[PDB]
Amino acid sequence: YHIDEEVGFALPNPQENLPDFYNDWMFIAKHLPDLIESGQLRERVEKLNMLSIDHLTDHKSQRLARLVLGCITMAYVWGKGHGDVRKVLPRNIAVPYCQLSAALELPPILVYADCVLANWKKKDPNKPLTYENMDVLFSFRDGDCSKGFFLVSLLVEIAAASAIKVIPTVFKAMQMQERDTLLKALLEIASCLEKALQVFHQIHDHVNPKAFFSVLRIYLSGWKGNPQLSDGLVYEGFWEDPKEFAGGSAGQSSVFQCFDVLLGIQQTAGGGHAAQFLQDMRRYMPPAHRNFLCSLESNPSVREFVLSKGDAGLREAYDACVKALVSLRSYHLQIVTKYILIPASQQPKENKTSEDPSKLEAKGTGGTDLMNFLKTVRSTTEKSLL
Ligand code: HEM
Ligand SMILES: N[C@@H](CC(=O)c1ccccc1NC=O)C(=O)O
Ligand SMILES: N[C@@H](Cc1c[nH]c2ccccc12)C(=O)O
Ligand code: NA
């Protein structure tokens, strides 16, 4: 299911170079802060020729070309972010991008698996995966804090990954009726979620709230339910009608959904605004990760095993996992308040009164409120406690 032992849902050692044939793409993607600032980005994109994708012959090269083209697409549509949008993606970019995306079974828009899971490198290959040994491959604007946002996102992803390798033992232990093994495995998983919560605290010293809200969030914004692009984006020369696709969210992270499905927590079931959003977000995940979540759903319920047992220790190990998931979502609520809500009331993007966000200048849907969505997801988690 293309899950790594060290990095989990992340692409191990992403490719950094494309074949020389695609150098013109690489040059524009590496120079977006320059080309955007100078108002030359759009002109440069419109002057490219069409480059066949036929010389992208391995998965890692295709993932890199998809990160490159996705970054160029965000920059082209939004420009400087001052509201001067482009509603048609030119043929010479749009056609090879939609072909590539169909080969990778991903939508033709920048997603989490591009801008986080494939957008990193080690500075020192021989030194471990820590922030100060790492760097991102692409940024949009000078001072947009893309390095902090993408890399701390990744590191949280890597920390949660250490739980995914226990999930085999969880299911083996149930069928072997292995009480002590099952109980210890659940403690291990909770410990790994506790560690991802620790890593998530690093956001504050690498991402500035106002740069995120006022710069980086622009290029992470899609064209689903976006007043700037009511009917979607036109992929010239590929589809005749505009299409609507949500922007990046870690809604597109398997991580929280992986543990929702493992623990028998039903976000995924019986819900209006929520649940449906979580399931559509699976369309923005790499196919192998989509399948991993669906195989998980087909296993016996860990939760119902644990209720049937009359075992206070087993029940406590399970609750430790649910509790860690709750804390992660409580903490993620605070983050969203600092990085989206508070800036959006200080008048760089207006909602209602001060904190009635459609989530604002963003990407997929806000319905009424993203905090209502996020609170609903968290509240369902805490009602799963035994
Ligand atoms: C750092 C690692 C992060 C992870 C692992 C993560 C994970 C998630 C997940 C799994 C969801 C889906 C809801 C849920 O399952 O509870 C979500 C939603 C959301 N996240 Fe995050 N998140 C991270 C960072 C951030 C940051 C820094 C922001 C800054 C505002 C943010 C903004 C949002 C928003 C606005 C939503 C609501 C869905 C949407 O409208 O996009 N996330 N996140
Ligand atoms: N930032 C939050 C929570 C927090 O900082 C925290 C610190 C250590 C271990 C866990 C935490 N989050 C628990 O939900 C606070 O202000 O308390
Ligand atoms: N979801 C927030 C920011 C965010 C959180 N996780 C993400 C992953 C990818 C891209 C953006 C995000 C937004 O609407 O912009
Ligand atoms: Na582990």
Tab-separated table of N, CA and C in Angstrom, residues 83-191:
chain	number	residue	atom	x	y	z
A	83	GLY	N	-6.509	39.628	-6.300
A	83	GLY	CA	-7.828	39.458	-6.877
A	83	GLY	C	-7.868	39.374	-8.389
A	84	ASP	N	-6.748	39.599	-9.070
A	84	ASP	CA	-6.665	39.466	-10.526
A	84	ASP	C	-6.460	37.989	-10.866
A	85	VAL	N	-7.560	37.251	-11.098
A	85	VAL	CA	-7.502	35.791	-11.247
A	85	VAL	C	-7.446	35.418	-12.728
A	86	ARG	N	-7.022	34.183	-13.007
A	86	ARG	CA	-7.064	33.616	-14.353
A	86	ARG	C	-7.965	32.396	-14.326
A	87	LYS	N	-8.978	32.397	-15.188
A	87	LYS	CA	-10.028	31.387	-15.168
A	87	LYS	C	-9.827	30.283	-16.198
A	88	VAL	N	-8.765	30.354	-16.995
A	88	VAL	CA	-8.459	29.348	-18.000
A	88	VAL	C	-7.004	28.978	-17.824
A	89	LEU	N	-6.729	27.694	-17.616
A	89	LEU	CA	-5.353	27.236	-17.567
A	89	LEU	C	-4.892	26.946	-18.984
A	90	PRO	N	-3.800	27.553	-19.454
A	90	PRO	CA	-3.425	27.404	-20.869
A	90	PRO	C	-3.146	25.959	-21.248
A	91	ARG	N	-3.429	25.668	-22.521
A	91	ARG	CA	-3.341	24.320	-23.074
A	91	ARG	C	-1.992	23.663	-22.808
A	92	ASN	N	-0.904	24.403	-22.992
A	92	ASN	CA	0.404	23.768	-22.972
A	92	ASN	C	0.798	23.290	-21.582
A	93	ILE	N	0.184	23.839	-20.542
A	93	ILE	CA	0.321	23.314	-19.193
A	93	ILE	C	-0.813	22.359	-18.865
A	94	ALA	N	-2.045	22.748	-19.207
A	94	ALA	CA	-3.220	21.988	-18.778
A	94	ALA	C	-3.232	20.557	-19.331
A	95	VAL	N	-2.895	20.367	-20.606
A	95	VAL	CA	-3.029	19.029	-21.188
A	95	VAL	C	-2.028	18.061	-20.545
A	96	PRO	N	-0.715	18.344	-20.485
A	96	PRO	CA	0.172	17.351	-19.854
A	96	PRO	C	-0.107	17.168	-18.369
A	97	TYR	N	-0.658	18.178	-17.706
A	97	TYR	CA	-0.960	18.074	-16.286
A	97	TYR	C	-2.139	17.141	-16.039
A	98	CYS	N	-3.193	17.246	-16.861
A	98	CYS	CA	-4.333	16.352	-16.694
A	98	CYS	C	-3.982	14.920	-17.087
A	99	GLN	N	-3.119	14.741	-18.087
A	99	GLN	CA	-2.691	13.392	-18.439
A	99	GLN	C	-1.897	12.757	-17.308
A	100	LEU	N	-0.909	13.496	-16.777
A	100	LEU	CA	-0.124	13.039	-15.628
A	100	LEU	C	-1.022	12.687	-14.442
A	101	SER	N	-1.952	13.584	-14.118
A	101	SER	CA	-2.831	13.378	-12.981
A	101	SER	C	-3.714	12.146	-13.168
A	102	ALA	N	-4.181	11.895	-14.409
A	102	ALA	CA	-4.962	10.685	-14.675
A	102	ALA	C	-4.106	9.431	-14.533
A	103	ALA	N	-2.840	9.492	-14.933
A	103	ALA	CA	-1.943	8.360	-14.708
A	103	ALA	C	-1.712	8.108	-13.213
A	104	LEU	N	-1.665	9.172	-12.396
A	104	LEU	CA	-1.456	9.019	-10.955
A	104	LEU	C	-2.758	8.922	-10.176
A	105	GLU	N	-3.907	9.047	-10.849
A	105	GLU	CA	-5.232	8.901	-10.233
A	105	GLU	C	-5.449	9.948	-9.138
A	106	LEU	N	-5.003	11.158	-9.422
A	106	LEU	CA	-5.131	12.315	-8.558
A	106	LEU	C	-5.774	13.431	-9.363
A	107	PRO	N	-6.446	14.373	-8.697
A	107	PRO	CA	-7.066	15.483	-9.427
A	107	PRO	C	-6.014	16.469	-9.905
A	108	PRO	N	-6.296	17.229	-10.995
A	108	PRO	CA	-5.342	18.245	-11.527
A	108	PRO	C	-5.327	19.556	-10.734
A	109	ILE	N	-4.865	19.468	-9.484
A	109	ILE	CA	-4.699	20.616	-8.591
A	109	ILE	C	-3.660	20.214	-7.549
A	110	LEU	N	-2.962	21.204	-6.985
A	110	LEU	CA	-1.969	20.899	-5.955
A	110	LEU	C	-2.649	20.266	-4.744
A	111	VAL	N	-2.163	19.103	-4.308
A	111	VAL	CA	-2.729	18.462	-3.122
A	111	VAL	C	-1.633	18.222	-2.090
A	112	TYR	N	-2.091	17.846	-0.892
A	112	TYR	CA	-1.236	17.543	0.254
A	112	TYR	C	-0.106	16.578	-0.098
A	113	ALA	N	-0.415	15.530	-0.866
A	113	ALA	CA	0.612	14.582	-1.278
A	113	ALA	C	1.614	15.199	-2.233
A	114	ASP	N	1.285	16.332	-2.869
A	114	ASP	CA	2.311	17.053	-3.614
A	114	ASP	C	3.112	17.965	-2.683
A	115	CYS	N	2.432	18.907	-2.024
A	115	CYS	CA	3.153	20.024	-1.445
A	115	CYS	C	3.716	19.698	-0.071
A	116	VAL	N	3.384	18.533	0.495
A	116	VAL	CA	4.000	18.107	1.750
A	116	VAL	C	4.743	16.790	1.548
A	117	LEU	N	4.026	15.754	1.128
A	117	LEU	CA	4.606	14.418	1.149
A	117	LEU	C	5.700	14.238	0.107
A	118	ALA	N	5.668	15.001	-0.991
A	118	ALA	CA	6.693	14.909	-2.032
A	118	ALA	C	7.625	16.126	-2.105
A	119	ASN	N	7.514	17.094	-1.182
A	119	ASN	CA	8.126	18.412	-1.344
A	119	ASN	C	9.235	18.632	-0.313
A	120	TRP	N	10.137	17.673	-0.155
A	120	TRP	CA	11.108	17.780	0.921
A	120	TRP	C	12.374	17.047	0.517
A	121	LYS	N	13.432	17.305	1.285
A	121	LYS	CA	14.736	16.670	1.141
A	121	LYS	C	15.486	16.782	2.474
A	122	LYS	N	16.463	15.893	2.663
A	122	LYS	CA	17.443	16.029	3.737
A	122	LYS	C	18.577	16.949	3.302
A	123	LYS	N	18.988	17.851	4.188
A	123	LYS	CA	20.241	18.564	3.952
A	123	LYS	C	21.430	17.621	4.108
A	124	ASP	N	21.501	16.905	5.232
A	124	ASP	CA	22.556	15.916	5.434
A	124	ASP	C	21.939	14.534	5.389
A	125	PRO	N	22.209	13.756	4.344
A	125	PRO	CA	21.543	12.450	4.211
A	125	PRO	C	21.864	11.503	5.344
A	126	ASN	N	22.953	11.751	6.048
A	126	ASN	CA	23.468	10.792	7.011
A	126	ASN	C	22.932	11.040	8.415
A	127	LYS	N	22.345	12.213	8.646
A	127	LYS	CA	21.686	12.760	9.817
A	127	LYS	C	20.176	12.586	9.691
A	128	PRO	N	19.470	12.442	10.801
A	128	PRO	CA	18.097	11.932	10.760
A	128	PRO	C	17.099	13.008	10.333
A	129	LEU	N	15.827	12.609	10.285
A	129	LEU	CA	14.761	13.481	9.788
A	129	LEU	C	14.310	14.413	10.903
A	130	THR	N	14.973	15.562	11.007
A	130	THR	CA	14.540	16.632	11.890
A	130	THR	C	14.448	17.923	11.088
A	131	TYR	N	13.693	18.875	11.640
A	131	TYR	CA	13.443	20.130	10.947
A	131	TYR	C	14.737	20.770	10.437
A	132	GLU	N	15.729	20.929	11.318
A	132	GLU	CA	16.944	21.661	10.976
A	132	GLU	C	17.842	20.905	10.014
A	133	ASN	N	17.552	19.631	9.741
A	133	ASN	CA	18.227	18.887	8.679
A	133	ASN	C	17.411	18.784	7.385
A	134	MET	N	16.385	19.603	7.209
A	134	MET	CA	15.477	19.393	6.074
A	134	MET	C	15.190	20.702	5.353
A	135	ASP	N	14.597	20.581	4.165
A	135	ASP	CA	14.171	21.789	3.481
A	135	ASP	C	13.137	21.375	2.439
A	136	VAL	N	12.285	22.341	2.035
A	136	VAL	CA	11.268	22.063	1.021
A	136	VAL	C	11.866	22.260	-0.366
A	137	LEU	N	11.166	21.733	-1.391
A	137	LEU	CA	11.657	21.903	-2.753
A	137	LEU	C	11.100	23.149	-3.437
A	138	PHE	N	9.885	23.588	-3.100
A	138	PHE	CA	9.260	24.719	-3.779
A	138	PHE	C	8.563	25.640	-2.779
A	139	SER	N	8.573	26.941	-3.103
A	139	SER	CA	7.874	27.995	-2.370
A	139	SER	C	7.168	28.906	-3.366
A	140	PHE	N	6.254	29.740	-2.868
A	140	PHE	CA	5.488	30.629	-3.735
A	140	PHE	C	5.951	32.081	-3.680
A	141	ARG	N	6.147	32.618	-2.478
A	141	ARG	CA	6.475	34.021	-2.267
A	141	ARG	C	7.514	34.132	-1.163
A	142	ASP	N	8.333	35.159	-1.270
A	142	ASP	CA	9.384	35.340	-0.295
A	142	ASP	C	8.716	35.637	1.057
A	143	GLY	N	9.123	34.911	2.096
A	143	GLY	CA	8.480	35.107	3.383
A	143	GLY	C	7.076	34.548	3.523
A	144	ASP	N	6.708	33.521	2.743
A	144	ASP	CA	5.382	32.913	2.874
A	144	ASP	C	5.317	31.824	3.938
A	145	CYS	N	6.454	31.471	4.547
A	145	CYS	CA	6.551	30.432	5.575
A	145	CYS	C	6.177	29.041	5.042
A	146	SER	N	6.316	28.831	3.729
A	146	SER	CA	6.041	27.512	3.171
A	146	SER	C	6.959	26.448	3.778
A	147	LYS	N	8.226	26.785	4.042
A	147	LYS	CA	9.117	25.793	4.639
A	147	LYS	C	8.601	25.342	5.999
A	148	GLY	N	8.208	26.293	6.849
A	148	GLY	CA	7.686	25.920	8.151
A	148	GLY	C	6.407	25.109	8.055
A	149	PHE	N	5.453	25.585	7.255
A	149	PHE	CA	4.173	24.899	7.162
A	149	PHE	C	4.338	23.499	6.563
A	150	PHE	N	4.957	23.394	5.389
A	150	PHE	CA	5.081	22.078	4.763
A	150	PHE	C	5.888	21.111	5.635
A	151	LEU	N	6.994	21.577	6.214
A	151	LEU	CA	7.904	20.669	6.912
A	151	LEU	C	7.372	20.248	8.278
A	152	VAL	N	6.753	21.158	9.031
A	152	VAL	CA	6.158	20.697	10.280
A	152	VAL	C	4.949	19.806	9.991
A	153	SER	N	4.197	20.091	8.926
A	153	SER	CA	3.152	19.156	8.491
A	153	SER	C	3.727	17.767	8.282
A	154	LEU	N	4.786	17.687	7.475
A	154	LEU	CA	5.460	16.424	7.201
A	154	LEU	C	5.921	15.732	8.483
A	155	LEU	N	6.582	16.479	9.379
A	155	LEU	CA	7.124	15.876	10.591
A	155	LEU	C	6.025	15.296	11.483
A	156	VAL	N	4.895	16.008	11.626
A	156	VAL	CA	3.721	15.437	12.289
A	156	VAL	C	3.289	14.150	11.595
A	157	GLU	N	3.258	14.169	10.260
A	157	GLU	CA	2.951	12.982	9.459
A	157	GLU	C	3.917	11.826	9.755
A	158	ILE	N	5.214	12.114	9.784
A	158	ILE	CA	6.216	11.095	10.095
A	158	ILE	C	6.026	10.535	11.512
A	159	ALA	N	5.726	11.393	12.492
A	159	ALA	CA	5.543	10.908	13.863
A	159	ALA	C	4.336	9.981	13.956
A	160	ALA	N	3.214	10.390	13.366
A	160	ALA	CA	2.054	9.509	13.324
A	160	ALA	C	2.336	8.218	12.570
A	161	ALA	N	3.338	8.216	11.679
A	161	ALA	CA	3.624	7.037	10.864
A	161	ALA	C	4.110	5.874	11.705
A	162	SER	N	4.804	6.162	12.802
A	162	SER	CA	5.267	5.100	13.680
A	162	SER	C	4.129	4.295	14.296
A	163	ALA	N	2.885	4.788	14.247
A	163	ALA	CA	1.767	3.975	14.703
A	163	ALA	C	1.300	3.008	13.625
A	164	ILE	N	1.419	3.391	12.347
A	164	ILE	CA	0.848	2.597	11.262
A	164	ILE	C	1.490	1.218	11.199
A	165	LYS	N	2.769	1.114	11.558
A	165	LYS	CA	3.420	-0.194	11.545
A	165	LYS	C	2.989	-1.094	12.706
A	166	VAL	N	2.244	-0.571	13.686
A	166	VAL	CA	1.694	-1.425	14.739
A	166	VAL	C	0.394	-2.096	14.293
A	167	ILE	N	-0.363	-1.443	13.415
A	167	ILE	CA	-1.693	-1.861	12.969
A	167	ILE	C	-1.721	-3.324	12.526
A	168	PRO	N	-0.701	-3.836	11.823
A	168	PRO	CA	-0.639	-5.296	11.623
A	168	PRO	C	-0.705	-6.092	12.922
A	169	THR	N	0.066	-5.703	13.945
A	169	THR	CA	0.049	-6.448	15.203
A	169	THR	C	-1.317	-6.391	15.877
A	170	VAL	N	-2.011	-5.253	15.773
A	170	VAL	CA	-3.354	-5.144	16.338
A	170	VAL	C	-4.259	-6.240	15.787
A	171	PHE	N	-4.239	-6.437	14.462
A	171	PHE	CA	-5.170	-7.377	13.846
A	171	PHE	C	-4.720	-8.825	14.026
A	172	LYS	N	-3.421	-9.110	13.869
A	172	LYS	CA	-2.890	-10.418	14.259
A	172	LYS	C	-3.306	-10.785	15.684
A	173	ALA	N	-3.136	-9.849	16.627
A	173	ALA	CA	-3.356	-10.162	18.036
A	173	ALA	C	-4.812	-10.518	18.311
A	174	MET	N	-5.749	-9.841	17.645
A	174	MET	CA	-7.162	-10.147	17.843
A	174	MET	C	-7.465	-11.592	17.452
A	175	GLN	N	-7.224	-11.944	16.190
A	175	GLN	CA	-7.459	-13.317	15.756
A	175	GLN	C	-6.635	-14.356	16.508
A	176	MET	N	-5.427	-14.047	16.942
A	176	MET	CA	-4.771	-15.047	17.775
A	176	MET	C	-5.262	-15.020	19.215
A	177	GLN	N	-6.303	-14.233	19.506
A	177	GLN	CA	-6.758	-13.974	20.869
A	177	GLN	C	-5.556	-13.744	21.777
A	178	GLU	N	-4.908	-12.601	21.602
A	178	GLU	CA	-3.616	-12.311	22.206
A	178	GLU	C	-3.779	-11.065	23.059
A	179	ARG	N	-4.343	-11.247	24.260
A	179	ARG	CA	-4.740	-10.119	25.102
A	179	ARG	C	-3.560	-9.196	25.406
A	180	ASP	N	-2.454	-9.750	25.906
A	180	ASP	CA	-1.346	-8.892	26.320
A	180	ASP	C	-0.732	-8.174	25.125
A	181	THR	N	-0.628	-8.877	23.993
A	181	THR	CA	-0.102	-8.280	22.775
A	181	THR	C	-0.992	-7.141	22.298
A	182	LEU	N	-2.296	-7.403	22.194
A	182	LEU	CA	-3.227	-6.373	21.757
A	182	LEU	C	-3.141	-5.138	22.651
A	183	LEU	N	-3.125	-5.345	23.971
A	183	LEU	CA	-3.126	-4.220	24.901
A	183	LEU	C	-1.861	-3.374	24.758
A	184	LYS	N	-0.702	-4.021	24.628
A	184	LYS	CA	0.553	-3.292	24.475
A	184	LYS	C	0.611	-2.546	23.139
A	185	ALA	N	0.102	-3.170	22.064
A	185	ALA	CA	0.059	-2.527	20.754
A	185	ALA	C	-0.773	-1.247	20.781
A	186	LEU	N	-1.933	-1.275	21.446
A	186	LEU	CA	-2.748	-0.066	21.541
A	186	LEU	C	-2.026	1.027	22.335
A	187	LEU	N	-1.296	0.647	23.388
A	187	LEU	CA	-0.493	1.623	24.122
A	187	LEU	C	0.585	2.229	23.230
A	188	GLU	N	1.225	1.400	22.405
A	188	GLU	CA	2.209	1.903	21.460
A	188	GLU	C	1.592	2.932	20.520
A	189	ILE	N	0.403	2.633	19.983
A	189	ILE	CA	-0.232	3.541	19.033
A	189	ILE	C	-0.519	4.888	19.691
A	190	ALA	N	-1.149	4.860	20.875
A	190	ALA	CA	-1.418	6.086	21.622
A	190	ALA	C	-0.135	6.876	21.877
A	191	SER	N	0.946	6.181	22.234
A	191	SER	CA	2.227	6.843	22.458
A	191	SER	C	2.705	7.562	21.204
